[PDB]
């Protein structure tokens, strides 16, 4: 289930569908970037959608997942390509599962 979650997650992250969001995401999943902080569904799908738009590459490893009751922790890496200079960044994603896994934290660390 876990890395089912995970593999989906790094799907939508390819496309920022709305309607896998709807799915992945809580409805008040908090996302910090930094100095930028996003709240719901609408500002995390606007956030990946930017990326998207802004990137030549965007690859996601999905690097560990731990799961410890109702919660599951993915660290994961994104690679962002642009006219050959490529970002390395790490994020912490919590979800809690409810059968039905969804995302509260997304942080970059």
Excluded: C
Excluded at 15 to 25: I, N, Q, V, W
Excluded at 76 to 103: L, P, S
């Amino acid at each position: 289930s876990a890395r089912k979650f995970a593999d989906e997650f790094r799907e939508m992250m390819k496309t920022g569908d709305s309607t896998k969001a709807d799915e992945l995401f809580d409805p008040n999943v908090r996302v910090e970037v930094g100095d930028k902080r996003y709240h719901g569904r609408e500002q995390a799908v606007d956030w990946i959608r930017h990326l998207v738009d802004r990137y030549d590459h965007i690859e996601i490893r999905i690097d560990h997942i731990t799961v410890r009751g109702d919660r599951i922790s993915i660290v994961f890496t994104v690679h962002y390509e642009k006219n050959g200079e490529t970002t390395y960044d790490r994020y912490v994603m919590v979800a809690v599962d409810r059968g039905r896994a969804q995302i509260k934290m997304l942080r970059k660390g």
